[PDB]
Each structure stands twice: as C-alpha cells, then as structure tokens.
Amino acid sequence: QISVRGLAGVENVTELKKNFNRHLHFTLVKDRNVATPRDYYFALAHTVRDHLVGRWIRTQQHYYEKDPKRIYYLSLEFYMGRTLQNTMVNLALENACDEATYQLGLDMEELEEIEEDAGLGNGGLGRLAACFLDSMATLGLAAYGYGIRYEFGIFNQKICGGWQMEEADDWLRYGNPWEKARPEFTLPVHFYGRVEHTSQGAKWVDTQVVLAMPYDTPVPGYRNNVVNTMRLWSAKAPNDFNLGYIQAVLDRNLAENISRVLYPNDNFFEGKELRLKQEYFVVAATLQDIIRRFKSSTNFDAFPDKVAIQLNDTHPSLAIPELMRVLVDLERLDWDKAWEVTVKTCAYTNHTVLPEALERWPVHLLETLLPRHLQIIYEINQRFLNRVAAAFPGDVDRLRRMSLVEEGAVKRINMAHLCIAGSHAVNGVARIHSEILKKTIFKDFYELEPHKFQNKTNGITPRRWLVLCNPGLAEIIAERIGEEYISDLDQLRKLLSYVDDEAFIRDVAKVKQENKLKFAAYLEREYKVHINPNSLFDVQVKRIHEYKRQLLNCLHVITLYNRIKKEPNKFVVPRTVMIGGKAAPGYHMAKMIIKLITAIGDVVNHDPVVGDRLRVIFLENYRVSLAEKVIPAADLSEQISTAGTEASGTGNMKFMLNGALTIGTMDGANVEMAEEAGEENFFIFGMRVEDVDRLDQRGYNAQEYYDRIPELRQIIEQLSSGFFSPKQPDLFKDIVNMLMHHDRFKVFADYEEYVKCQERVSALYKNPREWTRMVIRNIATSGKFSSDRTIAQYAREIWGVEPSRQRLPA
Amino acid sequence: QISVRGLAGVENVTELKKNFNRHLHFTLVKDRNVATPRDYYFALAHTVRDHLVGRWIRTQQHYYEKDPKRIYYLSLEFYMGRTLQNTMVNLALENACDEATYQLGLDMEELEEIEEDAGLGNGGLGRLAACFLDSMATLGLAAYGYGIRYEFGIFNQKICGGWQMEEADDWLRYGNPWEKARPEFTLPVHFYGRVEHTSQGAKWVDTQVVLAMPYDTPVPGYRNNVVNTMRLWSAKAPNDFNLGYIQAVLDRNLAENISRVLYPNDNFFEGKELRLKQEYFVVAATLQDIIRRFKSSTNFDAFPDKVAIQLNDTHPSLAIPELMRVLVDLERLDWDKAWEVTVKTCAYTNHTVLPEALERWPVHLLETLLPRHLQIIYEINQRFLNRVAAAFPGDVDRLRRMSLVEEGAVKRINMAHLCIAGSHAVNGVARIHSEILKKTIFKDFYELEPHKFQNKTNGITPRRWLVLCNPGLAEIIAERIGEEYISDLDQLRKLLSYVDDEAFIRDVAKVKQENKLKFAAYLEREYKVHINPNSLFDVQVKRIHEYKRQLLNCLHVITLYNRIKKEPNKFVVPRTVMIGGKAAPGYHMAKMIIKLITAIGDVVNHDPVVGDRLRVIFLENYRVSLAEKVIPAADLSEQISTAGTEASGTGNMKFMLNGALTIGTMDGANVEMAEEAGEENFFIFGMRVEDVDRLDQRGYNAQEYYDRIPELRQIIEQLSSGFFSPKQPDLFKDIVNMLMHHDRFKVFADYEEYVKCQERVSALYKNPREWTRMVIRNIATSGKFSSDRTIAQYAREIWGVEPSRQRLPA
Ligand SMILES: OC[C@H]1O[C@@H](NC(=S)N/N=C/c2ccncc2)[C@H](O)[C@@H](O)[C@@H]1O
Ligand SMILES: OC[C@H]1O[C@@H](NC(=S)N/N=C/c2ccncc2)[C@H](O)[C@@H](O)[C@@H]1O
Ligand SMILES: OC[C@H]1O[C@@H](NC(=S)N/N=C/c2ccncc2)[C@H](O)[C@@H](O)[C@@H]1O
Ligand SMILES: OC[C@H]1O[C@@H](NC(=S)N/N=C/c2ccncc2)[C@H](O)[C@@H](O)[C@@H]1O
C-alpha cells in the first residue's frame, strides 16, 4: 500500500505464504480449523524470524574473522517493546507480510496486537538502551547488549476505583519466539564466601554458586543485513544445590530468584540485597563472556584496544572491581597494569542528579555478599584519595567529599564515585545535564580530571519512533525527499523548503487527523471511553514522579474547568487532556497523583455544562506499545519538569518527530530542541535553572503564591474541602500539605507562567494553518535527536571506533 | 543394515538430510563449524518429530468425527525414558535416519545418548503406564494419558564412598522437543476455601486458585499411523496472585511448587500436603478437560458410554468425589444418578498389598484442603455402609473394617476403600496378586460385590523392550518367522520348532555374546570398570526394597566368595554379579543395603585369589535408558521377592523376552511365566505363599536358621565383626539386627534353597548348548506378557471397547 513499507514481490509473497503454512502445521501443530489467533501470530513470528538467521550467523562470523573492537553495552534494563513489526521494518518485509497474510484471510495488525511487550525496563534509561542497540546495528558496530532475562518485567497497571493496582507481567507464559537459549555458554557466578591470603595472592573461597544461562536475541540493523546480539542472563541453580530431599529441590527457587523480577523503581534507589545480587550476576557473567571472546582472538595490554564496556548508570558499576579481581587474582597482573586496563576499558553514563536515585550500598552488605570486591574497592579508594591529596594538598574536606566510602551511621560506598574513578569517560545525557554535573555534584572530580567529562545528548531511533509507529507521516515525507532520511535523520532539514507548500501543509494536517481518529477508535474499542477527535490532544505520558510535575498539569486542568464553570457560554478551544504512566508500587505520593487525575476526570467528564469541551483521561498501562499509538496522535507534548531535574528526557524527542508541538521548561534536552527548532516554534515557560537556584537561596515559600493568585487559592480550597472527593473529604490532604509546605519541585512557582503559556497554545490551535506550519518547523529540525547521531558520537569520542553505513552481502 | 529397522529409500534419506540441515540452520541457528553434539541431537529430534504432526492432527480429527468411547488413563507417573529411538521405530524411520546421519558424517547412536530420560516415575507402576500408552496407540484405541509435568523427575543417583547421593533431575534444562504447550486449554484448580449451603445446594467458595496449563506429547502406535496424546499438567500462578510488590511476585513459587518434583517413594505412603495437592491438581484439571470434550460431542446418562477413567492405583482416587462434586454441585444431578454415572465410569487398578504403601489421608488435611470433597466422601461412606448393613445384618465388625473412614488417634480416609466403592471394576496385576486381594485385604469387599473383582496380568511393550533395545535378537527372530510378531507377540511360539535347530541355537548365543561385549565396553568407557565378558551375567535391577531381597542376593555373593577362599584351586563358573536400583532418599535400610553391596564389591573385586572368577558391580543410576542396555546383556534374571509381596513385577518379563533365564520365587507374574515356559525351564526356589503363611502362624525365628546353617553363621559373623568395613567395624549392625530380630521378609528362610538353586544355574551354564535351548524355550513362550495382550483385556473386559490393528491412511 505505502512505499516506505517495502516491495510485495510475487516470489516473496508466495514464499511467505508457504512458510506461514509450514509453521502453522509443523511448529504449531494446528490446521486452519482449530488455529487460535495466537497460533496465527506465532506462525507469522516464526516465518519472519527465519529471515534473520542467515544474516545473524554471517554477521557474527564476520566479527570473528575481522576481529573489530567490540562494544559491550551493560544495562540492567532493555525496554524493547514488541519485536515483530520492528523486524519486518528493518528487513523491508512489512508490505510483503501484509500481502501474504491478507491473501491467507488474516489482518496483520490484529496479529501484531497479540505479541507481549518485552517490558524489561522502567522508562527512559531502559528505552534508551533499546534505541541504542537499534542504532549500533544500523551503524554496523560490533556491539552486544548484555542484561538480565527477567521472568517478570515491569508490572501491568490496572486502575481500580481510580487507584493503581499492580499485576505480574508474565511475559514468557506462551514462550518467546525472539530468543535462542545458549546452554553451551552457561557460566558460574559466585556469592558470599570469604577471602584467604596466600603466598601467591588473595583467593575467594567457600562461595555459593549460581549458574548464568544466556539467551540471545537478534538485533537487526535497518536494511544493512547486520544482525547483532542482545544476550540476557537467566539464573539457574546447580544440580547438587542443597544436596529433606523434597525441600532441597524446592529451595532451588532461592538461587533462581535472582533473575525473577525487574525492580520497578524509576529514578529511586532501594538498598535491597536481591537487587545487589542482580547487579553482580549480570556483571560477573558478562565479564567472563567478554574475556572468553577476547582470548579466542594472554597479552592484556591490548584488552582496551579490543573491548569497550559502557556502563548504563551505576547499576553495573561492579564491572570495575570485578575486572580488577579477574586481572589481579586470576590472571596475576600487577595492580597498576590491571588498573590501567580497567580505566581504558570502562566508560560511565550518568542519568540523573536527584540524590535519592544515587546508588550508595551499605558496606555490611558488600562485606557479606562480595568480600573480595569490598577489599578491592577499599584499595581503589586509597590510591585515588592519594592522588587527590597530591593534587590538592591540605584540602581535607575535598578528601572526604571525593571518597568512595561515605561515613555516617552506616558506612556506604558511593557507586558514582567508583564509576568516575574507574572510567576514562563520564558523560551526561543532555548539554545542560552534563554542565550541571561539572558545576555541582561531580565538581570535585571535574577539577581533578577535566578530560574525563563529556556530553552525549540522548536520541531515539527513527525506525521504531517514526517508520514503525507513524507510517503515514514517514510516507508523506518520503514522497518529497526520498527514503534516505530514515538512517540519516538530518535530511529532514530539507522539509524547511516545504513550510509554505500548501499540498504538504494539508498532508501533514491530514496524517495527524487520521492518527487521532485511529487513536480515538482504539479508546472506544479497548476501553469503552468517548472522545472528541476534533479537540486538541494534550498529552503527558511518562513515569509518575513529583519532579515530572503531573501535578502542575492537574492544576492547569482544574483552572480550565473553573474558568468554564464561571463563564459557561464563552468559547474555549476544546481539549482532550491525557495523562498516563506508572507509579513505583512503594511511592505513595505518586499513587496519590494517579488517584487525583482520575478524581478530576470523574468530575470534569460528567459535568453537563462542560460538554465535549474538556475531557480528562488517564491512560492505563503506559508502556512501549501504547507509546507507539498515542505519540502519533498527540498535538501537544507536556514536558514540564522543574528546571534542572530531568537529565534529558526522550519522550520529548518522540513527540517532536511525530508532529506535536511542545510546552516545556528549559530542562534536559528541551533546551536543545528549542535551540534546533528556534524558540519561536516552542512553547517555553517557567523558571530557568538560575531562577530555581535564586529561589533556593531565598527559601521557597509556597504560601506567597497561594496568597497572591486567586485562581490558585480556589483550586487548593477545592482540593482541601473535598470537591474532588465528596465521600472522602480529606482524601487529598497529603497532596495539599506537600504543595503548601514541602514541595521540592516548586509547582506553584511555575503555575502563572504555565497557564499563560497554555493560553498561547490554545490561540495557535485556532489557526490550523499556522499550527501546522510550526509543526513542520519542528519535524524539520528533529534530526539531531536521532540515536544514530548519539551513537556516532559515543563511537568516535568514547569507544574509538568508526561507524559504517555499508551493507553486508545478503 | 538390519531388516526390522526399516527401509532406507533414496528419496527418504535425501529428504531427511535436507530437513536435518534446515533445522540445524533455522531452528538451532548454527552451522557445521560451531554446532555442538547437542545441536545435532536437536536437529535430528526436530526432523523426526516433523514426521509425527500430520498423523497426530489426523488421528485427533478422526476421534472427533467418529466419536468413539474415550479412555482416560490417570496416573501420577509416566516413566517414558527417551523418545527419539522409540519414535523412529514406530514410524519405520530408523534405518533411513541412520543412513541420513551417516552420510552427514554423524553417528546416530552417539546422538541418541544425548537425550535425557523423561524420568517421570519411580519404577514399575510408572513404566507400566508408559508401556500401556504404547499398546493403546498400537491397538488403535482413543486413549489419553493424563498426569503431571514434573519439572524434576526421579533424582539422578551418584555413588560417593559407596553411598547413594541424590541430585536434581533437571530434565527440562535444554528444552523438551517432544512436547507442545496448549495454553488455550489452561484451566483453574481450586484449593482450601469453605462450603456454604444455599437454598439450591452446596457451594464451594473463598478458594485459592492455581492454573493448570497442559503440555501434549505424541504417543505413536507401531506402524499404524495412529498418534495418541499424553497430556501433562503444569502449575501456574494466576497474575493477580498475592496482588510488598517484590515478595508477592517471588511468592508465586508457592503455587507453582505443585508440579515441581516427583515424590521418590516406591511402594511407600508419605502423608504430605504437597503430595495431596499434586493428586487433586491432576484430577481436577483432567476431569474438566474430560467433561469439556464430552459436551463438545447435557445428558450425562451417556457419560459412561463415551468415557472410561482408569485409576492407576489410588493416587488419582479423588477423581471419584471430584466427579460427584461436578455432577451434583455444578450440573445439578441428583445424588443417585451422579453415583451411577461415577461407578460406571471409573475403574481401579491396585499395585501392592504392602500395608505401608496404602494411602490413608488424615481427615484434618482433607478438611482444610478439600472441604467439599470430605463431605462428599462422608456421604459416600454412609450410603455404602448402609448397603453393607443390609447385606450382612448385625455384622458390626465388618462395618468398621469396610468403612472408608478409619478410627484411631488421627482419623484417616482409606483411599483404596473409596476406589472399590466408586468403581465398577477392581483389578490386580497378576493372577496370584488378584487372588490375594479376594482372599485377604479386600475379602470383605469381594463378598459384597464379587462381580467387581478381576485380574489383568501386567505386560511390557515388545517395541521398546525388544525391537528398540535388542535389534540383533529381533532380527534373528524375524529371519525365521517374519515381522508380524512385533505387534502379535504370541507368534513367538513358532520359535519352539527351532529349539533343535543348530543355526538358530548358534545365532541366539551369538546375539547374547554381542550384547554382553557391547555392555562390557559401555562399562569401561563411561565408568572405567573392568569385567570378564565370558562370565555369567547375574543381574538384579529394580528399586531397592527389603521385600525385593537384594539382601538375599548379597548373602549368595558372600557364600560364593567364602567357598572360593576355602578352596581356591577348585573350578567355579565365573560370574559378574550386577545389582542396581535407587533407594528412596528417606529409606535408611535401603541406603544401608546399597552401601553393603559396594562394600562387598570392595573386598571381592580386589582379592587376588578370586581373580576374574567373581566380580560384584553396583549399577549406578538405574533408569529406563540403562535398563535398555543391561537387560539385553543379562544371562540370569534375579526375581527373588518373598512370596506374596511383589504384586506382579515387569522387569521379570523384560529379561524373559531378551534371553536371560530366571531364578525366582513363585511370586507375582513369575508364577505365570513359569506356567507359560514350563517349570523345567525356570529356576524356581523357596517358600510358596502357603509356606510363608505357615511360618507366620508359628512365628518366624531367624535364630533357628543361624544355628543350623554354618555357612550362614559365617556370613553373619563377617558382617558383625567388620570384615566388610575394617575402619568402621559396626557399620552394618542395623542390617544384622534386622535379619536376626525383625525381618518381615524372611531372608534366612529361603537362603538354603536359593544357594542350591544357584548351583543348578551354574551347572547349566557349563553346557552352553543346553543353556541356549532353555533360553529359546523362554523367548518362545514370552508372548502372553505383551502389554498388547494386557490392554486388549482391559478394553474388552473393563472399558467396553474393541481394539483394532487396522491402519489409518498416511
Ligand atoms: O519457541 C519458543 C522457544 O524458542 C527457542 N528458540 C529456538 S528453538 N530457536 N530460535 C531460533 C531463533 C532464530 C532467530 N531469532 C530468534 C530465535 C528458545 O531457545 C526458547 O527459550 C523459547 O521458549
Ligand atoms: O537518559 C535516559 C533517561 O534516563 C532517565 N533515568 C531513569 S529512567 N532512571 N534512572 C535511574 C537511576 C538509578 C540510579 N542512579 C541514577 C539513575 C532520566 O530521568 C531521563 O531524563 C533520561 O532521558
Ligand atoms: O523446542 C522446545 C519447546 O518446544 C515447544 N514445541 C513447539 S513450538 N512445537 N512442538 C511441536 C511438536 C510436534 C510434534 N511432537 C511434539 C511437539 C514446546 O511447546 C515448549 O514447551 C518447548 O520448550
Ligand atoms: O503393576 C506395576 C508394578 O507396580 C509396582 N508398584 C509400584 S512401583 N508402586 N506402587 C505404589 C503404590 C502406592 C500407593 N498404593 C499402592 C501402591 C509393584 O510393586 C510391581 O509388582 C508391579 O509390577
């Protein structure tokens, strides 16, 4: 049907159809009389997956023969979403499969909906890892993602009585066709035990062993015939484990619990032993695998020439002392040489400056679980502090600030300090964030080793986040400028010369309307909710956090409702306000915020005077597959974190690419987005970082805003008095108390500017032609935010390798 | 190479080779450069399994269209062993696959050794279920085996320092190619809760739910194109289970523990709640599946015409009250009608008379776990006892003996009594066993309802137990009498006319020698032990139990050693004495017996004077795949249980079919074997059942034998004084104490006759020609012991269906 989806050749369609039938029969053991819709999905998945294998084998063969430098991306999170459509897109099979299934009397889109998301991440950090894998394959890098194969990913969110309920994401229940178990590479991981010192070095003895069994998932590049590997480890008890008899077998569960479940905390540290075990498990198994591959090329001097390890935050920080442990204790290298190798091998990416998110592990935990690593960390700290003392003689406070060991009630290890000390490169994820790292939390480190500190602004893959989710937009762009932009997103600049093109303006607006109609229809079918598709789609989707300020959005919504109630017969631009995202199960305030949103909806959506002029909808179970649907449908992207709190954001980039305008603070990558698009084409409001700093010096007094803004006082009075909870008058007292007395994120301080800015959004939307022209100016300048750009910068500036867009032979 | 292994057609070999390569590539994601031996096994398994699918789909289609009466074989054990060779045999693919793999440069036998046994059983009862499935498919019956998919089967046995060690049988670790998950037939199973009585019947409420997910395994008939199903249930937690957050996810393990592990007790009852849960789990899921299939044919009068349920011992006895529960509480049938349906549907097979093996569940357990079933059991008991009272007025002791409820310290439910009451047929598993049931333990029941009591003598499948494991023997037989005997084993009688045939005598002896050489070579390679292949192979393989009297075998072994030591320069017929089998982990005496065997070996095998005249070897990890190797190699089959204790035996039949002579008591099926072969062609010794009864009346005094048999006194003195355990003089004191003072199985009473009989065995072995002629007379009369005969009798006399040897079209 549409060009960017590829060719539907006669031979190809015929072959797909027969391979589909072969799989239905031989693989699924069904015929068309008894086959379930799930059977059809699996038949199709198997048919598509067959097309990966030749390329996958030859890619890995090629790496073995050419021996390039290998890149190892270590993450506890890979937020992959669904795989079927992505594989079809990257192999140019989409149109052919659509045709093949159509001829078999099946709707491919319906089949696609059957696939579970691989929800192995919480949000931004995990999705970033996934976009990165796509870009690394597309750029022909010899890259491997390494992580954990969680049996349960991020929980499925159900809303019951306006409250978040969690249920287990049993994503492997029907079997995962996109993985291959690799039992021959099963490896032992050690825990507990004790350290003996012999005549010939330290030895780690009396350990408990858990096996790490790898599962490989293919990562196809975009039409370049490259298929890289994501290798995820699963925990397995050894067979003699605990070996009355029955109990010993049942107790195997204890060891295998390591890979059971993803910790559902977004930007928050929880010092639990099981989490520490997960972090070591991935690191120990991965490093053995890396070393094995390196030896199958004795001389560890060449190790950094053949290996780069990228640490996705501090979660895999134990890679540093683990590498030292293997090099010193097992390979018998001297400390200084091992350390040189380690530093040149490792690089560290920081993802937040929020203090509660930073990993600070109690010493007593590491002492019991990882005694040799603790000793190695102490030694690293001593040698590091000796360097600081020599550089800054007599500066005793600097020594305590820079220490890897934090003193206090319980001694803790600061993992971020460990990462900086043991990495040749430290990067933030947007320009303002990287500057904040140098100026504030890592200032001491920057002064010691300025050359270590870099910026690498985040990006998103235009395959998933344009071609896959928004084929209509991809097509109208390709019609004017060709297909090359899909792997060279900077080419979107060419669209600037179409900003006054009446045909293009109409097509851009038409694609948006179609997307909105489709999404409005999705909402009725799967959720029985009614929305006006001619309204402005105002969306904020992202994890629920105080710093992300869904509450400020709530305040605006109530403002609009109150204004309508006061002047019912005045025209207002109709809006559908959509808010979605999961709250960490233990985060009370975030759970209260969800209840508030639904409570507002309950009042607003049933007020006869309001009509279809204002609707508030909570988008349940926000996840990658839902983002692919809602983002193409959005008109207005809410990116409203307090300045200095959102390191980068990536949801912001997704909306920009898909034709929504942005209302946002100058925070994270919003700054660079406004810079690329021009500030005239962005709805910027609120305090800058400098303004927040000024307010902190004076002391933030929320009462002042309450006293001076009548519209704000009304809202607080409504919340307090039970207007939004008639049968539980004090339900939202915690929210009011927080806003009035202990608001770290200064919700009231940005309220007036936000409401004014929102008025300017409504004004522009009234002029569809000018709305669309500004949209074109956003899409046209979204090129910088391709993860291909980001990865090219990591490659050249950190890993020391050159990207290549050249095809491997098919 | 050999005829019974089938044709290796040009087209077939070519096609197998290309399908093997296709699977290696697409399924296993390997090429020949990196493929592991395990990869090759899997490629072959997939290639063979592809040949099942068409037949499997059309068999099940045929049942749906023809709607025959369906047979449901319920067992907690299906001891399947390996599947690859069995599938090749039954599809006539063995020679073709051998040729195809040979041309690919691979040895198929080596590949076969990679497959894990499906060890989902303990011994005889579980293997019987497996032989039965093979025979039911071969006889074209619409039969389904239903059981539990244990994650861990029978433990792997390791011998360390002469002691049994257990390790987890993680048989699914690499994935099972012989199963297909059927998620669409996932069913809820209920536990705990309470009973409410409403205006319209009882209701079982507030229950905990565990899901039962089925996995289907194909059961191919022998060259008849029939493929039946074995459906095994796996336990899955529902997704809202226990739904701080992390713990709730980890706690899902509790529900899923139901299908985690097989209880490793052979002929012994352990009243553990987890075991009770397993028993209900299989019954509840299976009955829902049966009822679903029956409705997809309201009128439950026709239920027994379309359904037979065979209970493999009392393990699935809860089928009776569960069927009543569904019929009365859910379908709203009156009690009397439901009961009529239940009795006509169910039949019960008893497998032992040993009192410690009988299931007697504490009332308090059933009260908590299954409150509605307990109430139903009470009601069954009341109505049953009312029938007994009417038949035998005033016989108050009969009422207490026949009650389903046993009084005492803890009240218990006798599950065997439940089974008799609720079944239209009760059978024992050999003629003497069935007679013992009528005369002793079920005498009261037999007097009430004599028509219920039947015999069905056990059998073994001649596919696995001749063609598969002993192709050389199968071939020399087929050369004289054709191939028809493989599914009509009575045809073996024709071999009687070859008993004086010099060519056949030589061929029978040659096949045995070859088997012995192969087994002697297996022992060196995989265990580094040296044996004389010209010695008589004296083997006792079966689970370790006091009743099976491995100890009596030990006494003979020591007797032979002592006799050699006394007269070193006297000729004796050389023997290799092989004993193997697992002990239940909690059975102390059985574990001591294993240690004794190895301790004897340690003395005997290292005595220079003995030479290669006597060797004692403990066969480690005895299991189905090991039986397939050792049984063909045996000369002498030890079947030496105390008369009246081994219900049937099936190992005995396996040895008879494979050309070993039997030394045995008149116990179980040994009686019928001697009857078929003629007593002159069997080495019978020892007390008959009547003699044991006489001894019990007088009181068994072991001391009398010790006092009157000098050779026996010497052995006991050696055991006591530490001759077989120099550094732990009293190691075997428990064994001596048991033999002298509390021997339930009268080891000493059969000692003299056993040793004498063994002398007659040695005498015959000295005359190879006469040894072989007696062997021919055993093989020739082994036909009755085909499980095809057994199943034909169940079909005609219990299930009310006719077997058919007719092919389905291919
Ligand atoms: O079918 C479900 C099972 O599939 C298996 N995959 C096998 S046999 N081949 N895959 C090959 C493959 C080829 C190309 N891209 C991905 C995988 C997985 O090992 C197993 O964990 C999973 O449960
Ligand atoms: O860079 C990708 C995205 O990462 C997000 N971080 C997330 S999801 N978790 N971090 C968790 C964390 C845990 C422990 N120590 C530091 C951070 C950032 O908040 C976002 O601005 C950014 O766009
Ligand atoms: O490969 C390992 C996996 O195989 C799967 N089998 C599938 S996809 N088809 N089988 C078809 C089949 C055809 C004929 N005879 C048996 C099975 C099983 O469902 C899964 O439990 C197992 O882990
Ligand atoms: O019939 C097949 C074989 O079954 C065996 N029984 C075994 S393995 N377990 N029974 C366990 C059991 C448990 C509970 N209540 C009764 C028996 C018999 O011992 C054997 O003679 C016979 O050949």
Residues annotated in a binding site of A: 31, 64, 292-297
Structure tokens, A28: 């699924």
Q: Which of B24, B57, B179 to mutate to test the pocket of ligand 3 (most atoms within 8 A of CB)?
A: B179
Which of B239, B259, B265, B621 to probe by mutation at the A interface, max A CB count within 10 Å? B239
Q: End-to-end alpha-carbon separation of chain A, Å?
A: 25
Using DSSP's 3-state secondary structure scheme, residue B520 falls into helix
Q: Which two tokens stand for residue A129?
A: 């890892």
Q: Is B611 left (phi over 0), alpha (psi -120 to 50) or beta?
A: left
Structure token pair of residue A625: 């597959």
Q: Is B568 helix (H, G, I), strand (E, B) or coil?
A: coil
Distance CA B254, CA B53 (A): 36
Bridge partner residues of A229 (DSSP): A144, A218
Active site (catalytic) residues of B: 351, 542-543, 548, 650, 654
* Nearest Cα to Cα of residue A371 among A321, A420, A417: A321
Residue A548: CA count within 13 A, CB half-sphere: 26
Segment holding A721, helix H or strand E: helix A710-721
Q: Identify the CATH assignment for B1-459+787-810 out of 3.40.50.300, 1.10.10.350, 3.40.50.2000, 1.10.3210.10.
A: 3.40.50.2000
What angle separates helix A733-741 from helix A588-604, to the nearest 10 degrees? Answer: 110
**Residues within 8 A of B (CB atoms), A 546-585 only:** 585
Atom of ligand 4 nearest to the CA of B647: 21
In CATH terms, are B1-459+787-810 and B460-786 the same topology?
Answer: yes
Tell me the two tokens of residue B317: 């006895």
Distance of CA B159 to the CA centre of its chain: 23
Chain B environment of A246 (Cβ under 8 Å): 261, 263, 272, 274
Q: Annotated binding site of A for AMP, which residues?
A: 31, 64, 292-297
Close Cβ partners of A610 (under 8 Å, ≥ 6 residues apart): A561, A564, A565, A604
CA A810 remoteness from chain centre: 32
CB atoms within 10 A of CB B387: 13
Q: What is the largest CA-CA distance in chain B?
A: 90
Instruction: Tell me, yes or no, if B497 comes closer than 8 A to chain A by beta carbon.
Output: no
Chain breaks in chain B (C to N over 2.5 A) after: 243, 297
Q: Where are the domains of chain B?
A: 1-459+787-810, 460-786
Contact A157, A621 (CB under 8 A): yes
State the smallest CA–CA distance between residue A627 and chain B in angstroms: 23
Q: Does B245 touch chain A (CB under 8 A)?
A: yes
- Contact partners, residue A211, CB within 8 Å, separation at least 6: A186, A187, A188, A189, A235, A236, A237, A238
DSSP class per residue in A141-187: --EEEEEE--SB-SPEEEEETTEEEEE---TTTT--TT-EE-GGG-E
Provide the 3-class DSSP secondary structure of residue B248. helix
Which residues have C-beta within 8 Å of that of residue B281, sequence separation ≥ 6? B148, B189, B210, B212, B233, B235, B258, B259
Q: Which helix (H) or strand (E) covers residue A623, if one does?
A: none
Residue B511 tokens, joined = 């096949």
User: Nearest bound ligand to CA A361?
Assistant: 2
From A267, A546, A642, mutation site for ligand 2 pocket: most ligand atoms within 8 A of C-beta: A267
- C-alpha distances (whole Å) from B65 to each of A770, B58, B308 are 67, 10, 19
Record: contact A38-B184, CB cut-off 8 A: yes
Contact B181 CB / ligand 3 (< 6 Å)? yes
Q: Which sign does the torsion angle of CA A131, A134, A137, A140 carry? A: negative
Q: Tokens 């489709």 correspond to what residue?
A: A518
Atom of ligand 3 nearest to the CA of B172: 23
How many helices (H) does chain B have, and how many strands (E)? 32, 25
Is there a contact between A261 and A234 (Cβ–Cβ < 8 Å)?
A: no
Residue type, A767: N
Q: Which of B15, B29, B157, B227 to mutate to test the interface with A (most CBs of A within 10 A)?
A: B29
B726's tokens: 């120099």
CA–CA gap between residue A467 and residue A184 (Å, rounded): 37
A533-544: b or e for each residue (b if 16 or more CB lie within 10 Å)? bebbbbbbbbbb
**A355, two tokens:** 């203090």
Rounded Cα distance between A764 and A762, Å, is 6
DSSP label at residue B358 = S
Q: What element of type H or E holds A740?
A: helix A733-741
Residue A571, class by beta-carbon neighbours within 10 Å (0-12 exposed, 13-18 middle, 19+ buried)? exposed
CB contact at 8 A, A150 and A242: no
Tally helices (H) and strands (E) across chain A: 32, 25
* Method used to solve the structure: X-ray
Region of A268 please: left (phi>0), alpha (psi -120 to 50) or beta: beta
Chain A residues whose CB is inside 8 A of the B64 CB are: none
Characterize the bridge pairing of strands B163-167 and B156-160: antiparallel
- Ligand in nearest proximity to the CA of B171: 3
CB distance from A334 to chain B under 8 Å? no
Distance separating alpha carbons of residues A358 and A380, to the nearest angstrom = 20
Q: Residues of B with CB below 8 A from A53's CB?
A: 25-26, 29
- Residues B679/B657, Cβ–Cβ less than 8 Å: no
The whole-angstrom separation of Cα A646 and Cα A739 is 20
Cβ atoms of A641 and A547 within 8 Å: the answer is yes
Tell me the one-letter amino acid at B361: W
- CA distances, A362 to each of A368, A659, B64 (Å): 11, 47, 64
B355: number of CA atoms within 13 Å, CB side?
3
Residue B551 in contact with ligand 3 by CB distance below 6 A: no
Contacts of B91 (CB under 8 A, 6+ apart): B48, B51, B52, B220, B223
Q: Which DSSP string do the residues of A524-579 spell out, in sequence order?
A: HHHH-----TTSEEEEEES---TTTTHHHHHHHHHHHHHHHHHSTTS----EEEEE
Any chain B CB within 8 A of the CB of A251? no
Q: Judge whether B173 is closer than 8 Å to chain A, CB to CB.
A: yes
**What amino acid is encoded at A728 in this protein?**
Q
| Amino acid (one-letter) located at A155 | F
Collapsing DSSP to helix, strand or coil, B220 comes out as strand
CA dist., res. B108 & res. A656, Å (int)? 60
Strands A194-198 and A201-205: antiparallel
Q: What is the DSSP-derived secondary structure letter of residue A117? A: P
Find, in chain B, the residue whose alpha carbon is nearest to that of A270: B246
Q: How many other C-beta atoms are found inside a 10 Å radius of the C-beta of residue B288?
A: 17
Strand arrangement of the beta sheet that strand A636-639 belongs to: A614-619, A575-580, A536-541, A636-639, A661-664, A683-684
Burial of A500 (0-12, 13-18, 19+ CB in 10 A): exposed
Using the CB atoms, write b or e for A572-601: b if 16+ within 10 Å: ebbbbbbbbbbbbbebeebbbbbbbbbbbb
Tokens of A39: 């059977």
Shortest Cα distance, chain A CAs vs residue B97, angstroms: 19
Helix (H, G, I), strand (E, B) or coil at A688: coil
Distances (CA, A) of A253 to A233, A695, B252: 16, 52, 11
Superfamily of domain B460-786: Glycogen Phosphorylase B; (3.40.50.2000)
In angstroms, the CA A42 to CA A29 distance is 11
Contact A317/A419 with Cβ under 8 angstroms?
yes
Distance of alpha carbon B276 from the chain centroid: 21
CB < 8 Å to B180, chain A: 28-29
Let me know: does A49 contact A97? Beta carbons within 8 Å: no
B145 vs B309: CA distance, rounded Å: 10
Q: What resolution does the deposited structure have, in angstroms?
A: 2.0
Phi then psi for residue A203, to 5 deg, are -135, 135
Structure tokens, B685? 């010794």
Is the separation of the CB atoms in A112 and A490 below 8 Å? no
| CA atoms of A228 and B765, how far apart (whole Å) | 67
Residue with tokens 């549907």: B345
Q: At what angle do helices B431-439 and B670-677 cross, to 10 degrees?
A: 130
A70 C-beta neighbours (distance < 10 Å), count: 19
- What residues are paired with A299 via a beta bridge? none
Nearest to B586 among A173, A236, A244 (CB): A244
Q: What is the DSSP string of B457-480?
A: ---B-TIIIIIIT-HHHHHHHHHH
Spatial distance between the Cα atoms of B642 and B640, rounded to a whole number of angstroms: 7
How many angstroms from the chain centroid is the CA of residue B602? 31
Cα A142 to chain center, whole Å? 22
Provide the β-strand partners of residue A455.
A428
Give the count of beta carbons closer than 10 Å to the beta carbon of residue A368: 15
Of A635, A648, A613, nearest to A516 by C-alpha is A635
Helix (H, G, I), strand (E, B) or coil at A100: helix
Strands (E), A75-120: 78-81, 118-120
B170 touches chain A (CB under 8 A): yes
In sequence order, what are the residues at sequence separation of 6 or more whose Cβ sits closer than 8 angstroms to the Cβ of residue A534?
A: A574
B254 touches chain A (CB under 8 A): no
Q: Are B154 and B122 in contact (CB under 8 A)?
A: yes
Q: How far is CA A412 from CA A290, A597, A671, B225, B245, in A?
A: 29, 38, 35, 69, 26
Q: State the residue for tokens 């021996």.
A: A67
Report residue A533 as tokens: 């598709």
Query: Quick one: tokens of A253?
Result: 């569960």
Cβ separation of B272 and A246 shorter than 8 Å? Answer: yes
